[PDB]
A = this chain, B = another copy of it.
Amino acid sequence: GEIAAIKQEIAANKKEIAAIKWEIAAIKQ
């Protein structure tokens, strides 16, 4: 369904955001 598909994409963005924040932490050391 449409709503479920939307929720999945929001969740995927949440994962990428958490990955980036880890990366930013790693660059700063």
Interface of A is mostly: helix
B residues near A3, Cβ cutoff 8 Å: 2, 6
- Select A6's contact among B7, B23, B27, B28, beta carbons within 8 Å: B7
Number of residues of chain A lying within 8 A (CB) of chain B: 16
Copies in the complex: 3
A14 to chain B, nearest CB (A): 6
Q: For A20, list chain B residues within 8 Å (CB).
A: 17, 20-21, 24
Some 16 contacts from A to B, beta carbons below 8 A apart, are A2-B3, A6-B10, A9-B14, A10-B10, A10-B13, A13-B13, A13-B14, A16-B21, A17-B17, A17-B20, A20-B20, A20-B21, A20-B24, A23-B24, A27-B27, A27-B28
